[PDB]
Structure formats: C-alpha cells, structure tokens
Amino acid sequence: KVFERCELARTLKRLGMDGYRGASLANWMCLAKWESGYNTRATNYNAGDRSTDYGIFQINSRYWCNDGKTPGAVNACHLSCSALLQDNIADAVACAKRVVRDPQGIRAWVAWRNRCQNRDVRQYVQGCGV
C-alpha cells in the first residue's frame, strides 16, 4: 500500500509514535519518506551482505526480522519478515519501536542521518491535524 502523507501521520500518531524514545512524529515521517516513499511492500536486497530491507521503514533481515535466507541473522523483533510487508503497519511499527530502543536511537537508520538530522522536518506533518 502506498500511504498518503497526512494519512500516515495520523496513523503513526494513533500507534503511539509521537515522541517515542524522544523522537518526534515529524522525524518518523521523514524516515518513512526517504526509506520507502510510504510504501509498505518496498524491498531492497543488499548484494554486498546477502540481507534484505523490508517494508515502510526498511527493516534489515540480519538483526530484526527472519526471512530464513540471511547468513548469521538474528530475529530481535521476533517476526517473519513477511509481517513487514502487510498493508497494516502495526507490526512494522512495533519492530521500529524495538529498533530505536537500541544504543544509537533513531540514528540507527543511516538514511535518517543523511536526509533528516539537523534539518527542518516540520513540512512532513504540516496541515495533517496531528
């Protein structure tokens, strides 16, 4: 499913993301934007290390979810990576909450550092009513 901006904003707020671990809703919006363009079925195979990024938040199969084909992987979120491709983003959100809880916080996603950190992220939530 390809989410419309404000639709995603409101949906994330309902799931308890605004301020989750100190990270504002606008930051979560910036991240989803650059990772998949609000696409729940987005996948990126990483040839260099045989891992795959799944879903709206592009969660990696080496540490967070299990797809069965990634060498020496962990399943920290305790979910099949298939769960991260559903139109309903409740599982992905739950796995995203687990990812930020780690030592780097939201900095865990390199895309965040490149396109969101130290920038004006207001534009991602303006007029959405959140």
UniProtKB/Swiss-Prot annotation:
Reactions the enzyme catalyzes: Hydrolysis of (1->4)-beta-linkages between N-acetylmuramic acid and N-acetyl-D-glucosamine residues in a peptidoglycan and between N-acetyl-D-glucosamine residues in chitodextrins
One GO cellular component term: extracellular region
Gene3D superfamilies: 1.10.530.10
GO molecular function, one term: lysozyme activity
Keywords from the named record: Amyloid, Amyloidosis, Antimicrobial, Bacteriolytic enzyme, Disease variant, Disulfide bond, Glycosidase, Hydrolase, Secreted, Signal
SUPFAM superfamilies listed in its UniProt record: Lysozyme-like
UniProt enzyme class: hydrolase
PROSITE patterns, per database record: GLYCOSYL_HYDROL_F22_1, GLYCOSYL_HYDROL_F22_2
InterPro entries assigned to the protein according to its UniProt record, in alphabetical order: Glyco_hydro_22 (IPR001916), Glyco_hydro_22_CS (IPR019799), Glyco_hydro_22_lys (IPR000974), Lysozyme-like_dom_sf (IPR023346)
Localization: Secreted
Disulfide bond residue pairs: C6-C128, C30-C116, C65-C81, C77-C95
Biological process, per Gene Ontology: antimicrobial humoral response; defense response to bacterium; defense response to Gram-negative bacterium; defense response to Gram-positive bacterium; inflammatory response; killing of cells of another organism
EC numbers: 3.2.1.17
A family per Pfam: Lys
Active-site positions on this chain: E35, D53
Limits of the C-type lysozyme domain: 1-130
Entry's family note: Belongs to the glycosyl hydrolase 22 family.
Related illness: Amyloidosis, hereditary systemic 5: A form of hereditary systemic amyloidosis, a disorder characterized by amyloid deposition in multiple tissues resulting in a wide clinical spectrum. AMYLD5 primarily affects the viscera, and the predominant clinical features are renal dysfunction of varying severity, and intra-abdominal bleeding. Inheritance is autosomal dominant.
Subunit structure: Monomer.
Job of this protein: Lysozymes have primarily a bacteriolytic function; those in tissues and body fluids are associated with the monocyte-macrophage system and enhance the activity of immunoagents.
Note: Lysozyme C is capable of both hydrolysis and transglycosylation; it also shows a slight esterase activity. It acts rapidly on both peptide-substituted and unsubstituted peptidoglycan, and slowly on chitin oligosaccharides.
Protein name: Lysozyme C
